[PDB]
Amino acid sequence: IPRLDTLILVKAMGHRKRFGNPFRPKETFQAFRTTDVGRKLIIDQNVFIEGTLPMGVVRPLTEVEMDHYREPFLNPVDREPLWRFPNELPIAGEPANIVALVEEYMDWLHQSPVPKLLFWGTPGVLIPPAEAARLAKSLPNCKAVDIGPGLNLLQEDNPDLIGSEIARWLSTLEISIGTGFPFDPHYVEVLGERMHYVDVGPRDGTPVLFLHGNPTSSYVWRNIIPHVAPKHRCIAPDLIGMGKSDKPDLGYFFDDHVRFMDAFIEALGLEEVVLVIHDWGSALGFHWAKRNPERVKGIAFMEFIRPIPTWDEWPFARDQLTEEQIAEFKEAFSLFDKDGDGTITTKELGTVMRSLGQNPTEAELQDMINEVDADGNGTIDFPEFLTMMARKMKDTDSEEEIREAFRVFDKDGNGYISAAELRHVMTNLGEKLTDEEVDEMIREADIDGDGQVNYEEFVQMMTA
Based on CB atoms, which residue is closest to ligand PUJ, 88 or 446?
A: 88
Interface pattern 304-343 for Ca ion (x via CB under 5 A): ---------------------------------x-x-x--
Residue 38 binds to ligand PUJ (criterion: CB under 6 A)? no
Residue 38 binds to Cl ion (criterion: CB under 5 A)? no
Residues within window 267-296 making contact with ligand PUJ, judged by CB under 6 A? 279
Residue 416 binds to Ca ion (criterion: CB under 5 A)? yes
| Residue 85 C-beta: closest distance to Cl ion, Å | 4
The one segment of 47-55, 67-75, 377-385, 398-406 that binds ligand PUJ by CB under 6 A: 47-55
Residues within window 246-265 making contact with ligand PUJ, judged by CB under 6 A? none
Beta strands 193-200 and 234-237, pairing class: antiparallel
Based on CB atoms, which residue is closest to Cl ion, 158 or 282?
A: 282
**CA 79/CA 77 separation, integer angstroms:** 6
The one segment of 44-52, 75-83, 201-209, 435-443 that binds ligand PUJ by CB under 6 A: 44-52
Residue 122 binds to ligand PUJ (criterion: CB under 6 A)? no
Residue 446 binds to Ca ion (criterion: CB under 5 A)? yes
Interface pattern 45-84 for Cl ion (x via CB under 5 A): ----------------------------------------
**CA 247/CA 291 separation, integer angstroms:** 26
Nearest alpha carbon to residue 249 among 241, 237, 257? 241
Angle (CA) 185-190-193 rounded to 5° is 80
Contact 221, 200 (CB under 8 A): no
Residue 179 binds to ligand PUJ (criterion: CB under 6 A)? no
> In the set 214, 245, 379, 418, which binds ligand PUJ (CB under 6 A)?
214
Residues within window 185-224 making contact with Cl ion, judged by CB under 5 A? 214
The one segment of 43-51, 141-149, 266-274, 437-445 that binds ligand PUJ by CB under 6 A: 43-51
| Residue 454 C-beta: closest distance to Ca ion, Å | 5
Contact 235, 188 (CB under 8 A): no
Size of site (CB under 6 A) for ligand PUJ: 15
Nearest alpha carbon to residue 23 among 446, 393, 382, 415? 393
Residue 418 binds to Cl ion (criterion: CB under 5 A)? no
Residue 213 binds to ligand PUJ (criterion: CB under 6 A)? yes
Residue 156 binds to ligand PUJ (criterion: CB under 6 A)? no
Residue 412 binds to Ca ion (criterion: CB under 5 A)? yes
> In the set 56, 159, 237, 243, which binds ligand PUJ (CB under 6 A)?
56
Residue 14 binds to Cl ion (criterion: CB under 5 A)? no
Based on CB atoms, which residue is closest to ligand PUJ, 158 or 345?
A: 158
Residue 85 binds to Cl ion (criterion: CB under 5 A)? yes
Which spans of this chain sit near ligand PUJ (rule: CB under 6 A)? 28, 45, 47, 50-52, 54-56, 125, 151-152, 213-214, 279
Which spans of this chain sit near Cl ion (rule: CB under 5 A)? 85-86, 214
Which spans of this chain sit near Ca ion (rule: CB under 5 A)? 337, 339, 341, 373, 375, 377, 410, 412, 414, 416, 446, 448, 450, 452
